[PDB]
Amino acid sequence: DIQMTQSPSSLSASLGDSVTITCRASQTMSNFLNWYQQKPGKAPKFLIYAASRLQSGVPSRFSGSGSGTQFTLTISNLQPEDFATYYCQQSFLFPYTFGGGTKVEVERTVAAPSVFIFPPSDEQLKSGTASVVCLLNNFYPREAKVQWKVDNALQSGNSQESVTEQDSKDSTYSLSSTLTLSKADYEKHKVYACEVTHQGLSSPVTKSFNRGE
């Protein structure tokens, strides 16, 4: 019934900054809102109950506020251990629901991705499948649009992508997108391209090849 919407879904800041996370409920729910923290690979950690009450042991730099349909979690003097995902959860009425989560990531300067394309190898072609791979290398922020085009036809649904965790060194992301067709489907077309749109590019960058070469 009640659905929680968190904003923004991704947040970037540095040490010492004060970040604010918003949680909005589709219907009014007093102050029965809890906040949890989760880091990759670990279980969630209980942080805040009743919108503003801190659990014992939680550092006082965490604060919560809000009532009715809107709530906020604020983190002042952000520390290295604070970079994680945060979830709101309403305890007002069954069935109880969580927010979508919001990622507090390390902010850095914008960096345009390096785009590369890989046609399918002859070895996979002998098996009966063809995988075209498109690589975006060391970009920031994570927001990026990758479009597969086969003979100028936009592909939608027959590809899958994967994004690495934020790099511990230079704090960038990398993306891999695989478009897998069957061999007779692959032999029926000629042009294969991936078009990349990102904040760091002056214009969309298209990398393409013909099935011949």
Partner: protein
């Protein structure tokens, strides 16, 4: 030390059943509400169900998506909480966390004044029909369309394996700088596929040897794939 630890997860075929369990310590299990939450890989938390304490006769409730399929059992004499999941679907694949529920301002009764103060490790449940299979390793060969002004990209595509994981190294571990091994994706066929890439000086192509070492231990498959320019 208050502790919750789960167990009993496994690979289950669609339509089967599976009982996950939660062992508690450091507190009287019968005096708290106990919830089950789940998290699909790479997604968010989803509240699954709840079992009430002894004051409320251990009554249970469940989310609509598992309501006609999941059941809770409490063995407070042994401090155990069992979640029985029947007629499992592909979408049931997730990490299942057992969670202790604590009430604040309990003078007001058992209303919405509760939180979840202790989470367990979580146990992974995967509902799949795929059987153990070693992967095929294809080369993502560097070429003109894989060069960016002195930088070239090359790699390996480790396709159609089950289950996770595979490990990938480059030149037996000699090569680390510029290596990005991506998390695997699950294909429509139920098999996994991942990519491992490395960016090198384009002037090193043809004169420096690059080998990707792939190991899929569940099928004891081990391959050393040389990647040459195209």
């Amino acid at each position: 030390e208050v502790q919750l630890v789960e167990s009993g997860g496994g690979i289950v075929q669609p339509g089967g059943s599976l009982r996950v369990s939660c062992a508690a310590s450091g507190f009287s299990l019968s005096d708290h509400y106990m919830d089950w939450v789940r998290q699909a890989p790479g997604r968010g938390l989803e509240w699954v169900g709840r079992s009430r304490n002894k004051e409320n006769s251990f009554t249970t409730e469940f989310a609509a998506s598992v309501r006609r399929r999941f059941t809770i059992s409490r063995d407070d004499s042994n401090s155990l909480l069992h979640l029985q999941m029947n007629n499992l679907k592909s979408e049931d694949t997730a990490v299942y966390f057992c969670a202790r529920v604590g009430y604040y301002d309990l003078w007001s009764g058992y209303s919405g004044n509760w939180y979840i103060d202790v989470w367990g490790r979580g146990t992974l449940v995967i509902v799949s029909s795929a059987s153990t299979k070693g992967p095929s390793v294809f080369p993502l060969a560097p070429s003109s369309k894989s060069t960016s002004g002195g930088t070239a990209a090359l790699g390996c595509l480790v396709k159609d394996y089950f289950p996770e994981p595979v490990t990938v190294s480059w030149n037996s571990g000699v090569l680390t700088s510029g290596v990005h091994t991506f998390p695997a994706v699950l294909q429509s066929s139920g098999l996994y596929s991942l990519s491992s890439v490395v960016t090198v000086p384009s002037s090193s192509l043809g004169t420096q040897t690059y080998i990707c070492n792939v190991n899929h231990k569940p099928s004891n498959t081990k391959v050393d794939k040389k990647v040459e320019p195209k």
